[PDB]
Design a binder for this molecule. Sequence first.
Ligand SMILES: *[C@@H]1O[C@H](CO)[C@@H](O)[C@H](O)[C@H]1NC(C)=O
Ligand SMILES: *[C@@H]1O[C@H](CO)[C@@H](O)[C@H](O)[C@H]1NC(C)=O
Ligand SMILES: C[C@H](CS)C(=O)N1CCCC1C(=O)O
Ligand SMILES: [Cl-]
Ligand SMILES: [Cl-]
Ligand SMILES: [Zn+2]
Length: 574
Amino acid sequence: DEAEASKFVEEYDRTSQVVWNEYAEANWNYNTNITTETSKILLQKNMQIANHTLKYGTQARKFDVNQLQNTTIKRIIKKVQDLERAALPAQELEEYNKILLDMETTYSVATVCHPNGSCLQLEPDLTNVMATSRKYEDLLWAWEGWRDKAGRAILQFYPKYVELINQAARLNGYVDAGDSWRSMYETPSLEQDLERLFQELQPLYLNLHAYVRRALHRHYGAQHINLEGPIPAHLLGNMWAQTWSNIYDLVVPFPSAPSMDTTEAMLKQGWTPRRMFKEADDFFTSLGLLPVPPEFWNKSMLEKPTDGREVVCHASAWDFYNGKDFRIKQCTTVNLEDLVVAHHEMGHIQYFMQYKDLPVALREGANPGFHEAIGDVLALSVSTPKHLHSLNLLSSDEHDINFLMKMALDKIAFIPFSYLVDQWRWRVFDGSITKENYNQEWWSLRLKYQGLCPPVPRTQGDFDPGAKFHIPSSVPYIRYFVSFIIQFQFHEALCQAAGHTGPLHKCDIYQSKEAGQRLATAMKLGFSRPWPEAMQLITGQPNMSASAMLSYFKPLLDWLRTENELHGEKLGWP
Ligand SMILES: *[C@@H]1O[C@H](CO)[C@@H](O)[C@H](O)[C@H]1NC(C)=O
Ligand SMILES: *[C@@H]1O[C@H](CO)[C@@H](O)[C@H](O)[C@H]1NC(C)=O
Ligand SMILES: C[C@H](CS)C(=O)N1CCCC1C(=O)O
Ligand SMILES: [Cl-]
Ligand SMILES: [Cl-]
Ligand SMILES: [Zn+2]
């Protein structure tokens, strides 16, 4: 039945391209114009694609993959045997698809109002408050309000969501949804591997945490910051305290060595979202990589519509499975942070284009982490003072430590948060956490890993996890933890390939063809081989490692230890 295998795969591919392209269409229309009609159509298309999935998934299961020779064929068929949600009986599938849509819409349209009538949306209103306000009470208002409006509204949907996604998981041979999600890495030692990486970054995070806590103590008062306890979750410049770069002004190591207001500069010289993406497109091409198609610039939504339209603002890259149509949907704002995000998303597009000629079943990254890392890698070089200066956005060890601190506030602070999200979800999926303890366990992990505490006590009815995009949107999060670790591994490898000598953090791979070549050969593999092969192609070795990230920040770790030591900080939070 070997010849039958090849035929089946060829047929699965042809048909899947058509149906998946059609689905992307409806999905895109809903995401870029949330309405009753677009929602209705999306739900209808869900059943259509599920029908396709069931038809081929059923046939695929009749193949004893064990008996198949061709490994590339063996691999595709094994993947098609997994029906995902399509495994759910029609009634549950319909209810499931609606739950997902209701949670997404609820999160996307949530607003926080004032007594008068001024209501703020998450993007860019609340996001801006969290990033620029230095008033304890105003930060609290936005922080609590977002959770009161978005978080609480998602709670009514989560338990049923968990029940259905787990059922689908069990119907596909997994013990639960978390199991199914983790399988995407094809790594039996995943959990222990991730745990080890997390532990390796502890010294660095705990030291960053202690330094920032001291700075907040200095700004917000001793009566509000316990130098031996967790940091209130609304003071880090970000709604989820996942990245702390926005409070750089409160923690600058050497305030005597000032740096230009990058954002002010961008706005000052008329930078626009389109300009931001163009610059990213240029960085990829400079490496010899592929430029985005003209179609990209015409169909993408690079700005928040003013049509009055309601949309899903969270940044995302789209592959329409026809090897020609690729788009980015992002409510881009003109500032450095979003400039990095633009590169992030462009990295996804580059990946799409790179493996566009493989069977659609294999048109995925080596693993989800790889897909998230590509753009961040280039953005690391983009963020260097030298590169920013070349873009006319910027104008000495002190400047060096300040830069490292700025990078750390984003990259190091994110490590514990990115680790925490799915630790929580895996436990919800496996039944360890019931709806009675959703929130309480969320905060135990928030405390355990990030050393954060809620500024206001939480109450029955609260569901803060629902206030984070990926939860109601049901998008796995561990990919971002993996990404942040491996992107430094890639940076290190690419820099060495470019001939860079000296401190890793000073490397800029701009215009390096040797660098673009390694990324290219790896991306071309798509999901055709276990990820360690792609890892090997890029770095010369096969494992995930925190060494690159540690080496990158070494100078900062040394500075932080000395600084915290002379101030007598007690690391951690008893
Ligand atoms: C928003 O979707 C509706 C369908 O409900 C459609 O009629 C309208 O034209 C769409 N708006 C834009 C700007 O495309
Ligand atoms: C395995 O099948 C795939 C898909 O048909 C084909 O591209 C590949 O060359 C085949 N490999 C071998 C060794 O036959
Ligand atoms: C934008 C991307 C997704 S394509 C996303 O959700 N990310 C990746 C960086 C961390 C992050 C997040 O929570 O915003
Ligand atoms: Cl929270
Ligand atoms: Cl993932
Ligand atoms: Zn991404």
